Amino acid sequence: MFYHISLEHEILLHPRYFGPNLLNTVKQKLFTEVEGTCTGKYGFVIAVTTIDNIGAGVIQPGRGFVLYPVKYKAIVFRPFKGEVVDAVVTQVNKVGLFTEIGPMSCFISRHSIPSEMEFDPNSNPPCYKTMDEDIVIQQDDEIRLKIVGTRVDKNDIFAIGSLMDDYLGLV
Amino acid sequence: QKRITTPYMTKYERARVLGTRALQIAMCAPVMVELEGETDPLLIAMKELKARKIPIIIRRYLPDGSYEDWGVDELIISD
């Protein structure tokens, strides 16, 4: 889910950047450190809107690197547990549907999929289709799923979804 | 403003300011004053203090928790 937040990040600036308008260097540096990363607590930081203010630069003793506490406004993608949200299918395998909820990728297990659905390996491209064939889930298909749980791995958030709940599927 | 600390710069502050600046100069930091062939980084920072150009701002923490931002240029150094 997308939110508007005000976060704090301590920016480490090398003394080489102590030239004219170093705040510009600090400002531009913040567009690389917290931009494009994925903090495990607040989720993916997809973009930064503006900068609130830049705090006083404290020189760390011994290290010689000035620390700049800067406040900025950014939008994060934090998948809350037990939240239903639309997803896009990227691939389908016997294990289960592989979905894509925006920046992150959510995996759907075969057990979580309704028993009526049955994987068809030949059908080009593969797509979980039930015997009645009223509903089929192909690749790049907009489907709604509920995230039972989320786990943080290697500075990234991995989500597990399910479709057992009512009104989850193509609709 | 409303600063109650002594206008003069203490010896400890002078030593740390020059040392930190000298370390910065050795790290490809820019020099405000003109360079006349002074290779040793300490000399570069020493004349910077004389000309009152060091960007470092001294934040003196009072024992009560308050802090005063005293600039190196503002402080009266002894030469």
Binding site: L13, F18, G19, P20, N21, L22, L23, V26, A56, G57, V58, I59, V66, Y68 | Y12, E13, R16, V17, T20, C28, P30, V31, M32, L35, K53, I54, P55, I56, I57, I58, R59, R60, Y61, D69, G71
Partner: peptide
């Protein structure tokens, strides 16, 4: 041990300066 004061970098004063190289 010399910790009653901390040195803080100021950008307004750094607005002037040329790199040695």
């Amino acid at each position: 041990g010399t910790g009653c004061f901390d040195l803080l970098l100021d950008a307004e004063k750094c607005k002037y300066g040329m790199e040695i190289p």
